[PDB]
Amino acid sequence: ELLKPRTLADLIRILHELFAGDEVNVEEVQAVLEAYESNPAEWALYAKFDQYRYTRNLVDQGNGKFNLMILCWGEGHGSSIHDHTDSHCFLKLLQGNLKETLFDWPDKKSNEMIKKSERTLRENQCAYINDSIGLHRVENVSHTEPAVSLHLFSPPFDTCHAFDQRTGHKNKVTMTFHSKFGIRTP
């Protein structure tokens, strides 16, 4: 029975219930993420920015079932085109706006990766992707507003691929945490 999360802590408690088993009800998880109304005071601890690129800030390890993290995007910061390592990805906006550009998996032949579509994800909205759907790039294209997003990855993963938009060629990337549980982790 899905109830509205009252706070980030309540959300986390509900997520531990939704991931208690071995499968994932994507629509329920997305609905509860969307229903949490972002409260900046509740997540300020995790919102640690870097001047030069976006940061990944671990919030909860989901009793091993998921990584819940907060990504902090300075003005003009964005990601590579990337996959999600056979995991679910839920992305909820906590502050600002992000542009999500979708791409299909490349063919073996070296070719330009052409976007399928793009959209603007707005405060409190929750997007979903997995490798069966395709690849994406996420960007804060704002010149004046930092963005903050809440990401849930299940199962957790520490590597993925970045794709060269010019060729479709992929390279393995190891993701690093800027902080864990509010503590800077150099």
Q: Is 77 annotated as a binding residue?
A: no
**Phi and psi (nearest 5°) for 37?**
-90, 115
Under 8 Å between Cβ of 113 and 17: no
Show Cβ contacts of residue 20 under 8 Å, excluding neighbours closer than 6 positions: 65
Q: Is 82 annotated as a binding residue?
A: yes
Look at residues 90, 152, 97 and name the one whose alpha carbon lies nearest to residue 123: 97
Under 8 Å between Cβ of 81 and 100: no
Q: Token match 């029975």: residue?
A: 1
Q: Is 169 annotated as a binding residue?
A: no
**Binding-site residue set:** 82, 84, 136
Residue numbering of the annotated binding site for Fe cation: 82, 84, 136
